[PDB]
Design a protein around this ligand. Structure first.
Ligand SMILES: Cc1cc2nc3c(=O)[nH]c(=O)nc-3n(C[C@H](O)[C@H](O)[C@H](O)COP(=O)(O)O)c2cc1C
Ligand SMILES: Cc1cc2nc3c(=O)[nH]c(=O)nc-3n(C[C@H](O)[C@H](O)[C@H](O)COP(=O)(O)O)c2cc1C
Ligand SMILES: [Ca+2]
Ligand SMILES: [Ca+2]
Lengths: 634, 633
């Protein structure tokens, strides 16, 4: 009886809302896919208008019709048949609009979508393009007269809470009390709730129902090796149905020993991901989400920081289904603005209500680098206490965290507010030397041994066009990014008290204000390029640390022209032995772990082949008289 | 300094050793690839001759040259430059021949290979074709004067033993003492051993050396999710080098609770596999081994019973590398013969010596269905006790087992000999009803609760060309094989005390005496056809039980013409919900587990689409007036 149709086709988009003619578009859509990815700090920001018609949907007697917007960046006004019905501030979360009373036979839908600079809607100051438009789907949902609530913060009127007790960690034996709370409109009598083959019927009172299932020997959601998911289903006499997937897992974060999953140590070692891509902008299809996740899996990252905003349900689903552990946050970022305080609380409420069921999520992020351009005063601290309190009020099952900028003094009162802290560190890239990452954490953990500390950002830019036999910080070479991550990976491996670490970033991403490292409009800290077509050499150092799929990878497949008489051939591998062949003749076999380095005298054009068991790779190395200038940013 | 050359090309095969002209072949080779797969109980058995030349290889002063045979089925006689040098009985194990003193610049190699019927070399009575020939590679190996022994039972002079102590099962924390024992000739004074990035020099005394490595926090070999492997490497003065991969794992078998790995319950649920394939015979390439394992992995089986003989080193390696737990055995099968007793002990020694290092292997099988055609008497008992004692003498780290024919009474003295037992049961196919599987094991386990019991064979024949809406034991339909395996799967799930279960068989396989189920020369109990091209529908019942890779499978993709007005549509899947679409129209969503059954009215030609999440499958069904007679045996 609950029916959904996608309002995907037959839109007309008006860049100038006042123009007589527009352009045909299909959702998802953004108007900044080109001008937000090419540099110049000039992508178009303002109010634009989407228009489309839709026919009156079939409705039960006293049924309702809702428009569902899953992503309208950043501020949306919904006008139906010339009446304005909704105003939404928050470009990353679902909202819905009851349009029943305005329905005629043919309905005019005008959506004004705004991504302008203002002081009321985060984000406003950040290192990523603020793509405007209807970049996620718009839907028309019809419900019976008695229905699960549709207007509360983009939720679905269901709140499922699995509380897990580990009985035998090694056997994965656990019990679970699963609470299903529901909220309903209309004069309902009772509701039926189905969980794990059991069924209960409970009374509705004041639009609210509750059911607890005491499950024994539940099948744990246990990370990448067994991401088992359950389904909770609630159904009303009149026929309305809602459901959430959920997973059963316990976890804790020990300030000294790190993250624990289901009674066992489970160090979180992964990356971050922005929700855009070359060409498409943030108008991502499902296949694009899946491809991003398939690259996560090949990499073997077991956690993703989904900065800096609520991501698509499809991607959180993918994390659920793949056993990936997620850090989720709101775009409370860089510069505090007093007029945005309510927007921070509104986006946090929608984030938690709409994502509370995802077992992949283990923490709520309050803000990112918020003291990069804010004085630490009572106003700032208050905004953070209110967000912290809201997280704890809505969700007893996850801690709060925030990502701190490296200038924030470690004794600031800011750090005492959330349950955990992670620092964004760029020592050895933006500032100082690589060693300062190690010392920063040794000193924090020595001063504050009872605090949980992590590494929420770290990286260095690499343009796969640039190379050097003597990489150094700032040459933007593929080789220095390897040097940087080789050091960070060892530094992290030495420090099991880091609760989670996240490479910034898995992918290059659009930042229209950047014009650095030979590519206009892109942050090049990705381990993979923005079009997902090139995995940079530094991707494979992490694959060597993380992946269990045997591989060998020769670095320098783009460092072909080499002026030096003896060159380093570097192989990344999760095997323990590698054999190098030069022009078909075996030159040397080394044992080791992860990183294998060979000295090769070169005199002409050579075919270099690396072998370990059944795994092989091959590159060309070509001696030249003078360094190739195309490899040089200078 | 140790060098190996493959003698693969430029052979001449003489099916009649007395005939002046023959057939140029390349190894691997068998002369039975065609006539052992087509029925008639008539493939050629006898002695055949392989001839090749090879150049004298480069040898250090006092170095040695060995011909290495990895598989000569079944009896080989090796003659170099007219001198008879070696006689080997056993078609499934490596042996080596010192040819040093007969070398000249251009060397003649003649190998007589015999797969004849006799009372000396097992196997002689079994349900599989006894392919003859050099069906695995022949190599020329040269070593320095001081070298690890080459002539001890096809081993390489290294015996590596990890003793694992589990410190914390949930954390996978464990220590292991790794003992490396070495045998060598040439009177070197010491040897250097490398294990896990450590090295150690120990003395050589009377051709033997021993080094112990006390590893802490080893990376456990932990089954399919993490088959981590180490290397033991030894190096002599003068340059000779041998090595063995090994894994660190502890395991135990509980008669009530089943198999345990690295401190946790790890029920062994899987398949068997014969080392042959359509067209190639048993002359398999490396890629054929890899494809077989790729199919094991898709299926999700975590154990393989490698019946009925020693398999290729490459395939044992694949099991090591993929975390597959293995049952290994010798072809002491069906019919005891007094003059084959020494051959059972020779093959078992070679099996253990050559495969002791494989962490995948967890038990040694003494015999299969040996009482199918043997009286249980003191002589039969003694042969088994001697095999049992040899396993225990050579290997303190693995239990023995045997596969019992279903006629063998459960109080027989035979059952008291091995450490564990498994029965080959075909209730519901060969005899009796499906329920008798359940009660056979109930009654055994109730009577002997302290004994380890398992299921070493079970299955039903299925010809993918045959189909029926009302399958019956004996119609050979793809659909009855699913009915059979649906029952067996549920029976097995109810009985955690079954230490291991093994579907007979992963693949159809050649049995030249069989003329059954519309295919001559093949046993059709495979879950996959013999050419590896068609996975029968019962394959996907197990994949729904075992695989974690999401999938949806429609049965009946070969059951296309159906006479019924409302036909049954069965989907196998490891998902929780399956939606069926007919001609594009969504028609029904069912929740459930493993097996999803739909009822679909059919009037003409329809397209049936099954969906769950991103997983899709599709078949075509055509309503007909009369049953297609091709679907009927
Ligand atoms: C996932 C989730 C969904 C929720 N859905 C509803 C809902 O539909 N209706 C409701 O009244 N409360 C819902 N709640 C709970 C309220 O947010 C909670 O009681 C809160 O403290 C009420 O605050 P408010 O009434 O000011 O919005 C939900 C909570 C969670 C975690
Ligand atoms: C894997 C493995 C390899 C062995 N290799 C040799 C060897 O090369 N030389 C040797 O004298 N014994 C070797 N042994 C010797 C064992 O002591 C021997 O097989 C058994 O105890 C007695 O052997 P025997 O009766 O043939 O002397 C090996 C044992 C194993 C398990
Ligand atoms: Ca621009
Ligand atoms: Ca034949």
């Amino acid at each position: 009886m609950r029916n959904t149709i996608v309002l995907e086709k037959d839109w007309t988009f008006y860049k100038n809302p006042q123009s007589e003619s527009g352009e045909a578009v299909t959702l998802p859509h953004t108007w900044n896919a080109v001008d937000g990815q090419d540099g110049g700090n000039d992508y178009y920001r303002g109010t634009c208008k989407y228009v489309r018609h839709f026919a009156k949907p079939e409705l039960e007697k006293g049924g309702r019709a809702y428009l569902e917007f899953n992503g309208a960046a950043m501020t949306a006004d919904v006008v139906v048949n010339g009446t304005k019905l909704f105003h939404h501030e928050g470009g990353f979360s679902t909202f819905r609009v009851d349009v029943t009373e305005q329905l005629t036979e043919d309905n005019l839908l005008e959506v004004y979508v705004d991504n302008s600079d203002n002081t009321k809607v985060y984000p406003q100051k950040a290192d990523f393009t603020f793509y405007g438009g209807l970049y996620r789907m718009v839907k028309l949902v019809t419900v019976p007269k008695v229905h699960f609530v549709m207007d509360y913060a983009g939720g679905n009127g269901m709140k499922v809470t699995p509380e897990v007790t580990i009985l035998d960690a090694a056997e994965k034996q656990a019990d679970a009390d699963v609470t299903v709370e529901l909220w309903m409109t209309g004069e309902a009598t009772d509701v039926t709730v189905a969980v794990a083959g059991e069924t209960q019927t409970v009374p509705v009172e004041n639009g609210y129902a509750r059911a607890v299932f005491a499950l024994k020997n539940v099948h744990l959601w246990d990370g990448v090796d067994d991401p088992y998911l359950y389904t909770a289903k609630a159904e009303l006499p009149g026929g309305d149905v809602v459901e959430r997937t959920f997973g059963c897992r316990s976890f804790k974060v020990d300030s000294r020993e790190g993250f624990f999953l289901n009674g066992r140590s489970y160090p979180l070692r992964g990356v971050s991901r922005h929700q855009d891509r070359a060409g498409a902008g943030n108008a991502l299809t499902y296949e694009m989400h899946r491809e991003d996740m398939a690259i996560v899996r090949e990499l073997g990252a077991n956690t993703i920081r989904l900065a800096h905003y609520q991501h698509a349900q499809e991607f959180y689903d993918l994390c659920d289904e793949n056993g990936i552990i997620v850090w989720a946050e709101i775009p409370y970022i860089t510069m505090h603005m007093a007029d945005g305080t309510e927007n921070t609380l509104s986006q946090m409420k929608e984030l938690i209500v709409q994502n509370y069921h995802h077992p992949s999520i283990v923490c709520w992020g309050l803000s990112n680098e918020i003291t990069a351009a804010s004085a630490v005063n009572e106003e700032l601290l208050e905004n953070h206490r209110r967000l912290n309190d809201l997280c704890h009020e809505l969700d007893k099952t996850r801690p709060t965290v925030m990502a701190d900028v490296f200038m924030l003094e470690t004794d600031s009162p800011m750090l005492e507010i959330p349950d955990m802290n992670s620092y964004n560190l760029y020592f050895g890239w933006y500032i100082g030397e690589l060693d300062q990452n190690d010392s920063f954490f040794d000193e924090y953990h020595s001063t504050y041994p009872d605090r949980v500390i992590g590494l929420s950002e770290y990286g260095a830019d690499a343009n796969p066009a640039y190379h050097s036999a003597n990489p150094e910080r700032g040459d933007y070479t593929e080789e220095y990014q390897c040097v940087y991550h080789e050091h960070m990976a060892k530094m992290i491996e030495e420090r099991p008290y880091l609760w989670a670490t996240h490479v910034w970033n898995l992918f290059d991403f659009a930042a229209d204000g950047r014009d650095e490292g030979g590519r206009h409009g892109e942050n090049q800290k990705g381990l993979v390029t923005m079009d997902r077509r090139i995995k940079k050499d530094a991707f494979y150092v992490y694959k060597a640390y993380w992946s269990k799929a045997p591989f060998v990878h020769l670095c320098g497949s783009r460092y072909t022209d080499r002026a030096e008489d003896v060159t380093e051939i570097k192989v990344y591998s999760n095997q323990k032995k590698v054999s190098l062949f030069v022009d078909g003749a075996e030159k040397e076999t080394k044992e080791g772990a992860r990183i294998f380095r060979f000295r090769v005298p070169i005199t002409g054009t050579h075919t270099i082949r690396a072998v370990s068991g059944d795994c092989t790779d091959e590159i060309t190395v070509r001696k030249v008289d003078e360094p190739n200038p195309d490899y040089i940013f200078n």
